[PDB]
Amino acid sequence: VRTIKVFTTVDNINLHTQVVDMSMTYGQQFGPTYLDGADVTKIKPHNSHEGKTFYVLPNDDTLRVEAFEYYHTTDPSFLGRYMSALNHTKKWKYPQVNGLTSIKWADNNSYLATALLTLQQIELKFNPPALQDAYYRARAGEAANFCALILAYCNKTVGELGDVRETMSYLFQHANLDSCKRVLNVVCKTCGQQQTTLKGVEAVMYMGTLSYEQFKKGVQIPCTCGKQATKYLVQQESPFVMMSAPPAQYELKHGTFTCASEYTGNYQCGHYKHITSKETLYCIDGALLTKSSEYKGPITDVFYKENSYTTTIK
Ligand SMILES: [Zn+2]
Question: Partners and quaternary state?
Fold first, then answer.
């Protein structure tokens, strides 16, 4: 029998020596098999494959533990989906735009570009080693693995319509936000006052207004009694806050926010751009860059810097 030595892996760190029969496909010997994202399941070993690393699915206890420790998921289709995405994202270009790693437009990826740009402007530490390692590479300019992981974690395929708010929620669920705390008060003229404390991801995300200042002053929401009540921020402890809303025309003022996402389109398709407030307002659209002193557009998400806030409302 003719053979070569190859290595299998689920995390591309821990390698497992294999001797493969060159007369059988990889799939016949390992199950679904991938070589830097390419599906080689139906391929027979080549001599140039000797010594190379192949991803496989977790099909024994060692690999199951290695995969969970690296990715913090046990979804059976995760690795196949990660590899399927990577086969595309490894072909994308990741230019440095105004000091940040962006993504050249491809494969309807504008939501991923503004998510990637945003991450580089807020204080966030990921928990899965896979995201820690891939984010480090992304910041350096090699973002293919990070982008493919975002797709895999969010159960999105390359080319599929994505929402920035939902994408950030997934990423935040895999980040250490345990120190983040939000205290809110809701005041109804009929029912009185009710305080609520939120933690973790729920402490840094709000859906309903783009304005952090409005959230501090009070937003109108329905009370269960039927009257409109006012909800306002009592206390905030976090390094950033994310304020989101359905797209609406909104003015972004230099120096009053960190960055923002703009969505032009409708519920079936559209396009995202990124706005960042630095020495002026920069609009990053994949590889494209423009600047302006003022900015108005259909904004969906705005990010703000924070440390500790306490209301003066009594
Ligand atoms: Zn009420």
Answer: May form homohexamers. Interacts with N protein.
The answer to whether 183 and 196 have CB atoms below 8 angstroms apart is yes
The answer to whether residues 123 and 239 touch, using CB atoms and an 8 Å cutoff, is yes
Q: Which CATH class is domain 181-310?
A: mainly beta
Tell me the domain boundaries of the chain.
3-58, 85-173, 181-310
> How far, in Å, CA of 137 to CA of 264, rounded?
30
Q: Among all chains, which residue has been given the structure tokens 């000797």?
A: 50
- Residues, CB-to-ion distance under 5 Å, ligand 1: 188, 190-191, 223, 225, 227
Cα four-point dihedral sign 297, 299, 305, 306: positive
Distance 187 CA to ligand 1 centre (A): 8
Domain 3-58 has CATH 3.10.20.540: yes
- Ligand 1 centroid distance, CA of 215 (Å): 19
228 C-alpha to ligand 1 centroid (Å): 7
Whether the CB-CB separation of 251 and 294 falls below 8 Å is answered with: yes
Method: X-ray
**How large is the greatest C-alpha to C-alpha distance in the chain, in angstroms?**
84
Domain at 85-173: CATH code:
1.10.8.1190
Q: Are 303 and 121 in contact (CB under 8 A)?
A: yes
Structure tokens belonging to residue 106:
């491809």
Cited resolution, angstroms = 1.5
Token pair of 179 as six digits: 């120190």
User: 57 with 80: CB under 8 angstroms?
Assistant: yes
